[PDB]
Structure formats: structure tokens, C-alpha cells
Amino acid sequence: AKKIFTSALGTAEPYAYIAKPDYPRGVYKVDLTIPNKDPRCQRMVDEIVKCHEEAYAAAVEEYEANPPPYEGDMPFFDNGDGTTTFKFKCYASFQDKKTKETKHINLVVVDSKGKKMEDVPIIGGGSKLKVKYSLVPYKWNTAVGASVKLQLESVMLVELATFGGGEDDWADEVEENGYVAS
Amino acid sequence: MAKKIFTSALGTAEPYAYIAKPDYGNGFGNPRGVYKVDLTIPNKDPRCQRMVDEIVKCHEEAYAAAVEEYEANPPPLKPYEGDMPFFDNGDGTTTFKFKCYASFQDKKTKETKHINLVVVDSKGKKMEDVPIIGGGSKLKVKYSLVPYKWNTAVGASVKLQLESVMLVELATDWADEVEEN
Ligand SMILES: [Ca+2]
Q1: N or C terminus of chain B: which is more exposed, having fewer CB within 10 Å?
Q2: Which domains, and CATH codes, for chain A?
Q3: Which residues make up the environment of ion ligand 1, defined by Cβ < 5 Å?
Q4: Distance of residue A158 Cα from the nearest chain B Cα, in angstroms
Q5: Where do the TM regions start and end (chain B)?
Q6: Quick one: which H or E segment has residue B71?
Q7: How far apart are CA A52 and CA A72, in angstroms?
Q8: What is the CA(A123)–ligand 1 centre distance, in A?
């Protein structure tokens, strides 16, 4: 069984796949950047670290008692600018293990009032969200060491970001031989 | 794992790179130190597009091989792709993520050794005392491509293994004084 954790309110990084998965088996995903000022930010980190140290401890405690170990990177990282980014992901499909078929799972997304949306807005970078998730410790492999996966369970869309209009939007509209910053 | 070596286009380093010294966050997990730099390159530089082509080709090739291997005897983990080690920033630039471990266990001798990352100036002169490379610095990097299969943690992708760095131009607040007192 899985215990549900809820993140602090954060800002979605670009390239989120919430309204639709990133497609091979699909994957929903969002990198959520939270201000370190939010105490919930440190608690999210503490929970993940605890999970890892306990699980890795156990993993080594059986590798050694029936072999055939190293640690990997945490699913979060302080950006050094007063914010920490957390990486959430979950598959878009699974195998009906009763009746064999592959089934598509849509990620539940709720608005700020808690209302589930059928037609989910595409979530652009800068959007404010809260996410519910599970901690899924995993063992070391040839690619990366043992760590924890923040398995996405659902998302609450708090603020939908505008597409365009900012600094980036202008990259596409440069003026030859014009004014240049100082 | 420095076999076929590629050279990046001239780019700009994102802040908090670890080139002059590695990142020993130890961040519990890989104790191993890590050298890393995120290099942002203008999309109109032709080498940028070629860099992407090469990574994508390496990925497609290795993923195709892994998939055929898996489908030849499906041994619950299905094939899937991870994120590429580069991303278009939507502003005419693309950021590439380079990294490598700061230590390794020797194959012949089994000795764990530390790796010093070679940094060269714009004319190829090895810099003996490497300056801390701040955000905004102009660099080129040498790297190898290390593809990897999908696993429980992440989907199949490619690591841009940092090999060495050329410092073309070194760039010139509140972190230290956080919260109270
Ligand atoms: Ca535009």
C-alpha cells in the first residue's frame, strides 16, 4: 500500500507533461520548483531522505544475505537561488494483471477548488501547482544508484501560466542592428 | 569511458558549475564527487544542431538495440525513453548537461583514484590553477556519449560524459546572509 504525500505550492518548470504524457510507454512528469522559504519544502526533503536511508539500508541488508550496491542522486536538488526543484513522474499505462491487456491511466488533475477536470489545460512553465505523490525507493542499477522515485498521484492546478509575452517570446523577433543592452 | 570524443560549440555556462573542483554534496547517495556544467548554446550556431543530431542518433541506435534485445525474450518493466541530456530553452538557445565522476576504480589495478578535470584556455594552454568558473563564462567542452537502457528509475537516454573543458572567457549576493541574525 502507498502513503500519499502532498507538496508545497511550487512553480512548474518548462516541459511538463501533466495534461498528456510524454511518449514506448508514456510518462507523466513535472519538475516542481519550491521556495526554500516554505517550511514544507524542507519536510518534503526530510521524508524523501528518511525513505531512502531506510530502504537502501534494507536493500544492502539482503544483497549481502543472498546476492547474485551504491547510492544514486536524490529526486530533488537545491538550485542555489533560494529554491529547490523536485522531480515527479508516473507511467501513463499499466498491465491488467488479471486480464492481460495494457490500459491507459489518465493523471487526475484538480482545480484550485478541488474539482476534477475532464479536459485538462496544458500546463506551461511558470504555472503554480501542488502535487500529491508516493515515495517509491528503488535499487541501484547499471545506469544510476539506489534512490527514491516521487511517483505522481494527482495534481492541483493553482495558477495557469500565460504562454508567451515575456523575454523568451522575443527571441523569435530580433531586430537587426538595433539597441543592444549596455 | 572516454572513447569517441566530441567537442561542443562555444556556449555559456549556467551558474553553479563544478569544473575547477567537483560537487561533493554527499545529498546522500552517490558519494562519488561529480564535475558538471550546463552549457547553453545559441541555436543558430550550426554545431549546436549537429550536437543534438549526434546525441539523438546515439540514443535512437542504442534504444533500438535495447528494444530488440528485450522483445527477443521479454523476461513489471517495459521499454520507455527518458529525457534527453539537452533541452531547447524556447529562447533560441539549447542547454546541454555535462557531467562525470571525480573518481573511479582502476580496471587493471583496482585502485580508487581521483580524477582531475583538464581545463585549457582559449589557445589550448592547460591551466594549472583553474579558476572557479562562474555563470556567464564562455566555454567549449569535450565529451563522450554514454547511452543507457531504461530501468526502474529512469527511461533510456544518453549521458554526456564530461572529458575536458576550454575556458574561453571567464565571467566576473545573499546566499551567505540567509534568514536571521
Ligand atoms: Ca515570438
Answers
A1: C
A2: 1-182 (2.40.50.140)
A3: A 169, 172
A4: 24
A5: none
A6: helix B46-71
A7: 10
A8: 19
